[PDB]
């Protein structure tokens, strides 16, 4: 129900995207495919359970 | 339809929108029409991997966003 809450969740996800894509290389590339994140640790990813719309 | 980036570290960062099953000749034609140059002088490398003007674009496996080092002949 809180639009500001959802917008800030998206902003926080896009911020933590930084240094999870920027920690590898200091470039902040264009795409950096999202699947590197949302694979669980059972397969060997992160387990980044996301709430914001991260379109693949 | 693919967007390629004919780039260089010398003040020439061009973005050409070219076809999927197109050749490299027409891609050079676009890159020359866009930036400043004629068609027969341009050379698109990627670390000494000289792209020739008879193989196709999708055949060399280029896709949306691939940046290519421009060099004049």
């Amino acid at each position: 129900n809180t639009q500001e809450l959802l917008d800030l969740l998206v902003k926080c996800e896009n911020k933590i995207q930084t240094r999870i894509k920027i920690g590898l290389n200091s470039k902040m590339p264009s795409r950096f495919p999202p699947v590197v994140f949302y694979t669980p640790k059972e397969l060997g990813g992160l387990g980044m359970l996301s709430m914001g719309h991260v379109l693949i | 339809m693919i967007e390629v980036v004919c780039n260089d570290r010398l003040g020439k960062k061009v973005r050409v929108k070219c076809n999927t099953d197109d050749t490299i000749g027409d891609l050079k034609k676009l890159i020359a029409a866009q930036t400043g140059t004629r068609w027969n002088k341009i050379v698109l490398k990627k670390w000494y991997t000289i792209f020739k003007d008879h193989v196709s674009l999708g055949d060399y496996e280029i896709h949306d966003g691939m940046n290519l080092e421009l060099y004049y002949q």
Binding site: S30, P33 | K46, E69
Partner: protein, 87 residues
Amino acid sequence: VLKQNPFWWTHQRHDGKLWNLNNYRTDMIQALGGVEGILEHTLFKGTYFPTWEGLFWQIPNRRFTLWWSPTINRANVYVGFQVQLDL
């Protein structure tokens, strides 16, 4: 305690588990392209392994930047300043 524990929602013993998440992973693996698709970026295409079997052993940092090294060290992500190694 000197650590803010998000336990105000409920108690894991008396109140039990507040949430349920396995159905999220079950949908995520499907949306990422199934097992073979969501995996197919990794270097197991090789590795003397024909199928998916349990083999789970700067350890995790290297393991992660290697296991996704082709899904990360591609040309369509970074700029096209391709760089060759010594060998």
